[PDB]
Amino acid sequence: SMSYTWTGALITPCAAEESKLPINALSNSLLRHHNMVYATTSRSAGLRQKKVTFDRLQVLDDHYRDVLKEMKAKASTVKAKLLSVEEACKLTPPHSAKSKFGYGAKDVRNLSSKAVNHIHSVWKDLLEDTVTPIDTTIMAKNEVFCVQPEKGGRKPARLIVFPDLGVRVCEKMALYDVVSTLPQVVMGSSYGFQYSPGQRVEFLVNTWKSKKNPMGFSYDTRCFDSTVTENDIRVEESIYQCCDLAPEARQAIKSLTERLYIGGPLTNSKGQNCGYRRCRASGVLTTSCGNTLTCYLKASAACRAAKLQDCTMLVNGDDLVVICESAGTQEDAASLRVFTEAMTRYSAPPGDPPQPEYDLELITSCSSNVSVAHDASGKRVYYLTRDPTTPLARAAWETARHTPVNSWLGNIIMYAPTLWARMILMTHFFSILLAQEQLEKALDCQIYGACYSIEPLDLPQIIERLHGLSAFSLHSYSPGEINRVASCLRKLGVPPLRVWRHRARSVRARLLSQGGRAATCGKYLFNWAVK
Amino acid sequence: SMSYTWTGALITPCAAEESKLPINALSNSLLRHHNMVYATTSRSAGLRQKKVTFDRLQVLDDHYRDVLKEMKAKASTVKAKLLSVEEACKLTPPHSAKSKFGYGAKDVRNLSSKAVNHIHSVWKDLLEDTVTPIDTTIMAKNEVFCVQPEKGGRKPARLIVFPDLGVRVCEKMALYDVVSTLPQVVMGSSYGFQYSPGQRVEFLVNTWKSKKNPMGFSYDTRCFDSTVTENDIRVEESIYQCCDLAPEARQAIKSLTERLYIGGPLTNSKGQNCGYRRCRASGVLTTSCGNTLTCYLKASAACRAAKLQDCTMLVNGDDLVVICESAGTQEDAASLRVFTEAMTRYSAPPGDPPQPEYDLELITSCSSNVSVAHDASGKRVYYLTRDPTTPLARAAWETARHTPVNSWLGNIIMYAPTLWARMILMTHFFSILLAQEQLEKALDCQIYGACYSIEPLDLPQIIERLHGLSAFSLHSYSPGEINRVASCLRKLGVPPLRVWRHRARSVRARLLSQGGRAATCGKYLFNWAVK
Numbered sequence A, B: 001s002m003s004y005t006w007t008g009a010l011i012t013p014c015a016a017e018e019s020k021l022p023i024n025a026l027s028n029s030l031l032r033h034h035n036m037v038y039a040t041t042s043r044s045a046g047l048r049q050k051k052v053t054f055d056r057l058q059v060l061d062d063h064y065r066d067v068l069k070e071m072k073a074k075a076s077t078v079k080a081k082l083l084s085v086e087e088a089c090k091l092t093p094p095h096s097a098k099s100k101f102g103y104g105a106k107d108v109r110n111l112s113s114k115a116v117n118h119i120h121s122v123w124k125d126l127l128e129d130t131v132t133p134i135d136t137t138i139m140a141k142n143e144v145f146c147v148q149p150e151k152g153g154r155k156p157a158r159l160i161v162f163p164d165l166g167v168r169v170c171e172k173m174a175l176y177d178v179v180s181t182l183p184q185v186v187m188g189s190s191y192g193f194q195y196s197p198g199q200r201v202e203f204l205v206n207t208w209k210s211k212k213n214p215m216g217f218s219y220d221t222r223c224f225d226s227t228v229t230e231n232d233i234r235v236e237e238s239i240y241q242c243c244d245l246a247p248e249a250r251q252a253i254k255s256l257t258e259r260l261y262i263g264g265p266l267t268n269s270k271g272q273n274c275g276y277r278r279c280r281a282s283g284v285l286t287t288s289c290g291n292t293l294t295c296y297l298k299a300s301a302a303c304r305a306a307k308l309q310d311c312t313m314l315v316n317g318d319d320l321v322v323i324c325e326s327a328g329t330q331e332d333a334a335s336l337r338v339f340t341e342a343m344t345r346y347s348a349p350p351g352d353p354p355q356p357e358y359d360l361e362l363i364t365s366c367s368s369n370v371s372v373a374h375d376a377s378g379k380r381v382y383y384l385t386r387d388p389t390t391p392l393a394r395a396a397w398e399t400a401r402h403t404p405v406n407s408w409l410g411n412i413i414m415y416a417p418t419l420w421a422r423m424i425l426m427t428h429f430f431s432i433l434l435a436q437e438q439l440e441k442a443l444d445c446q447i448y449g450a451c452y453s454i455e456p457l458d459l460p461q462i463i464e465r466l467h468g469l470s471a472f473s474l475h476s477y478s479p480g481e482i483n484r485v486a487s488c489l490r491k492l493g494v495p496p497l498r499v500w501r502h503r504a505r506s507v508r509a510r511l512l513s514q515g516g517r518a519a520t521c522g523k524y525l526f527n528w529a530v531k
């Protein structure tokens, strides 16, 4: 079936949309060539629709069936509970989209009688009606990127499809305890979301070093959510039902599967019908867990189809990396083509063909890669980095505007050991905090979980806990990493590293002069700048 | 050992304390004899200390050992997870006492870097140190009562003993998923906290009707928290460890048991050492679960000791009711004395001797009892009520002052079908909301779980969900119930029911005239008043 059917009504916005980088004193100081940075809007939605809309063919084989049996066996050892309305409310994110039924996320979290009575009514209805498709909203995402002048400049907006807030809370009642424990048990060390950046590095490096002649590749599925079939979503449901669950959870999980997860009608922000979905909804509770299980299942089967030797997989939703024993150059090339044909048969055809890699540094998984540097004693230290283009573009945007989502601080935390986060992001933002006397003021931050209220002065302690103390003394980065940062600085028109080291030497100076916790920041975050 | 040892430092307050009922237009309209209503303060703490301080002797027998084996067998089927720091933070109550380490409950719930970093540090310390007693604070509670002129007028303040906010969050990480699932599995239908008021009534009534000649009794332990021994708290720990838990949870549960739950030093609000505890702390996560398991264990053993026939127990923390088959009047009297001697040997000696009862209405459990009335069709409807004295006294207090804890609204919800909640509390408070134009304004409310933000206009829908529609049409209440309400109105100087019906007829009139949701309130909440 077609992943989507459309009526012709437009995907519409709910507010003014900016496509152009606010141009400037502070932001220009970071990034000069401002026309390379753009944001997506509803205007490009029409073209994303084209991309994500296609027929799916799916032919399963016994490799798939065997793997699914194994997964169900592990699932059968899992016990999970229903969350009460009140638990599900307290676990609702603070900025999540309001209900059309007259309450918002703050009401949910504060256990408002209105939200609570409503959610209670949605839950009854899930149990008593296992049929009627549940409404969803479709919207174009507003995200910031750099032009990719040579994979068209601007990409169109990605789409998000979500049910009403009331339903989202009921999803947690039925499934929060399942999605938060089940993939771990089924997939073990292949379950990517159990790892901090450092633990991800440890797994990848140990996996890589364990092969005599390692080969690895990332596998990029073309529009993964769109490739997920009805059968895939029912298979997911059958894995959930292998768990030892409460009677009401089983009923609600079945009902959510039938009425919401398999598909349903799509409504724009103006209330008209945009069309119909028969693939993964991007904005449900089970998006991540479901994509993970489904990717793992298809990929494990395809590894067997391709007869790849001593395969180790790491899966984060639609994001897949495999590391195996090389059979030789041409052998690997052939086996990866066979892997890809199996994935394609399972309804997960690729964006660009996967390529075998023989250098761990060149494998990008979750937009990141392992690199190496050395600490103060001279020992090799592996760490997670990424291409700094999107982080820098977004940091420039956030220098122009206020935001709950100032990604710059999340990037500083998650990528604290990197050359670019240390020399550029820390320097740039601490310069601004100092000048504006906002060093002590808490800022909202989306980490790859909740929303945190982070005091900048807590950064040394956060980084120490997450990265360890070597984060404050890494030196002698790889030539590939340095190259990539250098080319990105040129591309975007960021001042060279000379100009950052330098500027940081002055930032370190305010900080140390301020004494106290500000001096601790100068001391640990900027020890690289002095000597 | 002694339940407590004291140094002589005083239990001190953290703010001005009122003992006397604010005297008045609105509150006087509800309750005239204002000197009968008082609140407890730190000044009476010295005398509570005397009461809760005693040596415990405990001699276990094979009835106890057999029951414990059975409980452990059931516990062994339970699986439970660690909560992340972030989950435990989101489940922290909004008004919980701030940390001495520079953050409050709002910081915890908003995932502040300061709270988060701190809690992370407390958790490490729990895992790495299983020895050093953890500090606790002791405070006198401020609670409102009526004078009991014939069980001395005023009781002294109850005491609460709690660790720091950081530790309380770690308690949830280790044990939230255990305390929220384990007692249910071990104790089944005897676990009182699984029931709404109505489901509690259903269990009690069906249990009572299932005996040929029913007898029941409540058992009131003298200062239950004080009777809980070191061995009791280690037995609790051994039941927790029967669960299939994560390695870190096991370690933290052991460590919390050693450093906190078994005992430790007591510190007043001024920071000095008040003494040392060797019994149950009243303000830990495991207080309710622990008291429930321990009460159930001791009581089940004592039932066997006393050879009570076809026993059914209902347990809510320290609160215990048993319903069994009568062996005859003098036989029952003797068996209850033997039950009491067994409980006493197990270190749970009684306040007043338990008395056998042959009328379900006269058994008070959790300050409440089952009664009967009839609905609009004339069918018998069982419901939960209680002596209205404390609810009325507290409602009068809350008419004098603002409060997050306006118990009046919680009492209206939980006791919506009662004669007194309907005629007096609903009438009184809706009269005030109407006059002050605050009908649409949300109010904070502690139900016997979280803190709710309740819009008064949602009451009809809340009551319907919890009680059913018969709540709005109960008639022909029991003569015992009517008697008790009548005597309480005389005692406290509340206007007679004539004066309430009457006044409600006018309240119903504003409401219906207002139209909309206010009219729905007039229609359902006050249908008793018109006809």
Ligand SMILES: CCC[C@H](CC(=O)O)N1C(=O)c2c(C)nc3ccccc3c2C1=O
Binding pocket: A019, A039, A040, A041, A042, A043, A044, A047, A152, A154, A155, A156
């Ligand atoms: C110069 C016009 C830029 C605007 C800004 C925006 O994104 O809203 N812009 C479009 O109007 C637009 C359309 C209609 N389709 C696109 C398809 C792919 C990529 C970009 C598109 C843009 C676009 O950038």
Ligand SMILES: CCC[C@H](CC(=O)O)N1C(=O)c2c(C)nc3ccccc3c2C1=O
Binding pocket: A418, A419, A422, A423, A474, A475, A476, A477, A482, A497, A498, A499, A501, A528, A529
């Ligand atoms: C995080 C930056 C500290 C290190 C350590 C060092 O001083 O060697 N550091 C670099 O790695 C580095 C590089 C690769 N290029 C630079 C160019 C100009 C000025 C400083 C540079 C630094 C640098 O300080």
Ligand SMILES: CCC[C@H](CC(=O)O)N1C(=O)c2c(C)nc3ccccc3c2C1=O
Binding pocket: B019, B039, B040, B041, B042, B043, B044, B047, B152, B154, B155, B156
């Ligand atoms: C008339 C004085 C009433 C005060 C008010 C209060 O409770 O703080 N009051 C006491 O001072 C007091 C003391 C010292 N001990 C008590 C012991 C038992 C019950 C009441 C006590 C009160 C008391 O009410």
Ligand SMILES: CCC[C@H](CC(=O)O)N1C(=O)c2c(C)nc3ccccc3c2C1=O
Binding pocket: B418, B419, B422, B423, B474, B475, B476, B477, B482, B497, B498, B499, B501, B528, B529
């Ligand atoms: C919740 C009150 C409604 C009922 C129903 C009825 O009208 O019979 N109701 C009483 O039960 C009741 C009693 C016991 N005493 C009263 C005394 C004076 C006025 C009304 C009374 C009511 C009453 O309305």
